[PDB]
Design an enzyme around this catalytic site. Sequence first.
Site, PDB file in Angstrom:
ATOM      1  N   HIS A 195      -5.749  -6.101   0.120  1.00 54.83           N
ATOM      2  CA  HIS A 195      -6.370  -4.895  -0.366  1.00 54.83           C
ATOM      3  C   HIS A 195      -7.524  -4.476   0.579  1.00 54.83           C
ATOM      4  O   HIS A 195      -7.880  -5.186   1.501  1.00 54.83           O
ATOM      5  CB  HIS A 195      -6.879  -5.064  -1.820  1.00 54.83           C
ATOM      6  CG  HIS A 195      -7.863  -6.194  -1.984  1.00 54.83           C
ATOM      7  ND1 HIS A 195      -7.451  -7.457  -2.322  1.00 54.83           N
ATOM      8  CD2 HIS A 195      -9.202  -6.250  -1.893  1.00 54.83           C
ATOM      9  CE1 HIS A 195      -8.505  -8.245  -2.425  1.00 54.83           C
ATOM     10  NE2 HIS A 195      -9.600  -7.550  -2.140  1.00 54.83           N
ATOM     11  N   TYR A 233      -9.390  -1.909  -3.829  1.00 52.90           N
ATOM     12  CA  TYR A 233      -8.264  -1.047  -4.133  1.00 52.90           C
ATOM     13  C   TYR A 233      -7.066  -1.432  -3.289  1.00 52.90           C
ATOM     14  O   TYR A 233      -7.219  -1.756  -2.097  1.00 52.90           O
ATOM     15  CB  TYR A 233      -8.566   0.470  -3.839  1.00 52.90           C
ATOM     16  CG  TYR A 233      -9.692   0.930  -4.709  1.00 52.90           C
ATOM     17  CD1 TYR A 233      -9.457   1.351  -6.017  1.00 52.90           C
ATOM     18  CD2 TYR A 233     -11.006   0.825  -4.319  1.00 52.90           C
ATOM     19  CE1 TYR A 233     -10.475   1.663  -6.889  1.00 52.90           C
ATOM     20  CE2 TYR A 233     -12.046   1.109  -5.185  1.00 52.90           C
ATOM     21  CZ  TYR A 233     -11.782   1.517  -6.483  1.00 52.90           C
ATOM     22  OH  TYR A 233     -12.833   1.725  -7.333  1.00 52.90           O
TER      23      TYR A 233
END
Length: 272
Positions: free
Chosen positions: A49, A65
């Site tokens: 991520h 995210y």
Amino acid sequence: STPAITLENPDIKYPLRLIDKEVVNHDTRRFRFALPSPEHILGLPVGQHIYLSARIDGNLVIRPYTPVSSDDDKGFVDLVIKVYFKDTHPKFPAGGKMSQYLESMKIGDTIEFRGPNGLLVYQGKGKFAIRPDKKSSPVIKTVKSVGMIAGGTGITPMLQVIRAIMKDPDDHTVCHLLFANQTEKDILLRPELEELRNEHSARFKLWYTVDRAPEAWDYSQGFVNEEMIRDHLPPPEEEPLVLMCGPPPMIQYACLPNLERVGHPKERCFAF
Ligand SMILES: Cc1cc2nc3c(=O)[nH]c(=O)nc-3n(C[C@H](O)[C@H](O)[C@H](O)COP(=O)(O)OP(=O)(O)OC[C@H]3O[C@@H](n4cnc5c(N)ncnc54)[C@H](O)[C@@H]3O)c2cc1C
């Protein structure tokens, strides 16, 4: 040759420019940010991520995210975001810091990205490289199936892996996803998941649970529990890898105890 990567060093922050914002539904957005050139790729291994960081109301806020784009996409990165507005949920009156900040951004504003980050990398064809901590080498484990338990925003780490598997026609790994949400309305990425089921049912098993169900509901109601794990994840006899991503109480109370009750080694269940 290979495309230029954006994330060249994990300790560098890369301010990326916001170029498009889609209103998916009342509280869901897709944000598209430009990479440094149209020909760049992000440089995000499957399993990992990014972090966004910003000064939000005067304080540093950092959040992870997993994009819905991939390294196949040249020139941009897409984030699907659940906006947690203030004064909606009784337990969270302030709403969410980074998600409301993202909702506030104007086209042309930048936000800092960093990465890649995370202890798990998918190497293809069932092989996962999992570090016990950042300072340690990975344990390579090769599996025939992967159980996946996502809650809420925790879907995007799962979707990234599912897509990487399905796009390799010679990757025989079977993914079984159990996806929990507050309500039907709050489910992220439903069309995308259901397209994958339509195209790849032999390799992709999909099930939902919702804390509270609508009047017309074909799936489960309640928190993840032992029955749901038995019915919607590979059996422990098959030694699947189990991946999880969701709110801490979900992992702690709903997932790990029930994975253990079914017989999965709790110590080997990986949380993103
Ligand atoms: C590996 C990884 C990948 C992720 N990928 C994504 C992604 O692609 N998209 C994404 O949207 N998030 C993703 N997340 C979650 C993300 O990191 C943040 O937790 C999320 O954006 C909320 O942060 P925030 O600063 O807005 O909320 P915070 O200020 O941190 O609020 C804390 C928590 O309060 C709860 N909360 C606050 N307001 C509400 C409300 N109105 N209703 C219900 N709950 C509420 C939420 O559970 C929230 O996480 C990911 C997390 C991980 C670990």
